């Protein structure tokens, strides 16, 4: 109930264990306040109830600890799990009962961005750094300097899938190692030349597979003075593992160890890495420092938005007119609709990006813009946050159909529908594009599935709005909303 | 004969034909024919072309062909605009045409159309300065701001003389009420581009169209024009006034008004009147240049190795930050393979150029996402306005980029076969090999021996030092399995590829 505006939390739902970390902002730095780690093992393609409830409780304990954090400074994150879950949406729906902020699945080149950010703020060695992270479904490779990455890539070669495909039954074979390496070499063949020419002064790893290998290196005296995993020690570990005949350290880790061991051996050989450090912070720290930017009002999502506008040459003065009108409409319905501070940001971005499909074609640009936002690698945007952004651009013009309205409701409920509607009104009013002055009062109030738009001014100027707003009533009706227009003051 | 050039424009109201010959640095017109086909009027409420309209269309093309027997099919282009865009049965009409035409019909997008209209008007009234070109057609209206022979803005609005009569003057009755509805509807259309266009501004306005042609004639005959014989703003206001003094189309008595135009004059007048008002035009001049000349000029650039299609390719590379080094390597590998199989597969230079442009563009999708970029680049190539590219051309382009990368399925092949037949299929397969051979991005000398041979079964032989290319053979064996999913046996012989 007591709320601390400098408090920042972040929940990370891993494969075998979750984690909650709380922290506060002291002079632009992130001071640790709490850390809790609960093993659920829900991930280890339909999440069984034998662990689903175990997580829903773990999350309800966490949110009770999180009672002092503003939702603006809270972030839920997950990876390589609910992706491969038939009932994943149901667990998210069950978690949405529990948590106050929707789960976020971070993957691919966004996951890579966050590992490197977290490694960069933890280990502070200067220089061109290569970060590697062998996840369960995917292995991230980043070259960056300072906190700014240069190349970010995600190779679909995780330790879980490699065992499932080459080391199934858990039987260790000479050929099964070579086969797993060969698959890994072929994956790396896409980025090796680019990454090697670019070069690195330091090599840092992350995720469990790297951690496990680092330990056995130490325990088997195969590590280095600085516990730097070395090709020599790694190659020897490879030969020692081939002596086993089956899996039967850590009990959970030995299951995927053959896959991982080959993946790192392949990485070491194809990129000619000699020495490799380990960072535990992983993506958990990335999300926290991401959260710090949002606190500092330097959100990367915002910076990406302005970058997308420049790639697609969107009209800045038209974006400005749209985003202002939308805010005014947003504020005028803020309390009744119960729209959050996040929702204002969603609309602000979408209003900036709504004309981007115009760089593809002038017909159906709203559908094109949506395809771009749905599929692009936009740094800072997660899967769900992209999907809401594209949805707002996808329905800002043309006809509305109840069939799609249901799809929108599934994606982000009535709040996404209301924003989609607010964006429709904010474009419709700037359809004339360059304008002398506000064509009318355009005052929006709400009742219940019935909105009221009041219009007042010289109707002789801007005489299309009346018809436009009446054409818009029918489309609203297709989304179960009765928009009534008061033009009695517009004449 | 071999210097002869021809173009057929299948419009909404009329089909046009133009023949020309390039004499030294000048092109001399040989023939210019027109025929009323009224394809637009043949569209049903289901936007379906009546058999009567297709037969009129097929009768006119059979005559045009009769007059084209002495022009190289490589030096002819047949384009089609709004009425075939709209038609739901347009594929039927085109496949009925394919049996009588030497060259396939190419539907072209509105903005491509506006571009070629700009060309033909440009080369007519050649006056330095920024120009607004308005073309009121049967189904759509093209607005182009440009300078010299180069458009700055192009737009294409769904308003026209035949569509608007069907909606507001179907019976033939002229009522201020119906005329205002026709003006308001066109103002709605013009609103989408108004302020943008006006901001850009112009020094001169030219009109190209039968609607504009007929208004300029009736306004000079009735003394409503000016010294330069231009459609003025005032002459329109008066022409509108005396138009409304009639109550039916049958009683229009304007001198210089063809009988076939009285039906569509009211709606054509309403659109032009709304154009003049919304864009605040004061004087418009008429040009005989049109999509017909534009196609000829577009052809002249291709004959001079100045294909705007190649300029558009380089601009897209720019916009999607495509690696120019990878692009060249693939381009060069693709041309090597192409030359080793072009005779057995009966591939022409046009095929070659399609593979060349796809090769320059196969990685534009990386600007969207590194995952599935081949699909995302197909999406851009398929849905973008790309100057110089007809719809059929873009589509084959997007197919080449779309299949170049991952797993191949037999149902996709049949979609390819419907798009561009067996040639499209081979080009997609050559592009694949070209990328695969350059997948490492090595800038090293590829295994000296890359001989592609054809026997429904292809033979790829490799010979040289295998030291620089350690996974080439395994990527080739992986490609054999994809090649069989498209019913082709790729035979890999690497016995001399060693070390």
Residue numbers in the entry:
A (entry chain A): 4 to 47, 53 to 256, 263 to 505
B (entry chain B): 7 to 461, 463 to 506
What does the paper say about this structure?
Degradation of polyP into phosphate is involved in phosphorus cycling, and exopolyphosphatase (PPX) is the key enzyme for polyP degradation in bacteria. The PPX hydrolyzes and releases the Pi progressively from the linear polyP chain. Bacterial PPXs share conserved catalytic domains 1 and 2 belonging to the catalytic N‐domain, and most members of the PPX family contain two additional domains 3 and 4 in the C‐terminal. The exopolyphosphatase belongs to the ASKHA (Acetate and Sugar Kinases, Hsp70, Actin) superfamily protein, which utilizes a common fold for binding and catalyzing hydrolysis of ATP phosphoanhydride.
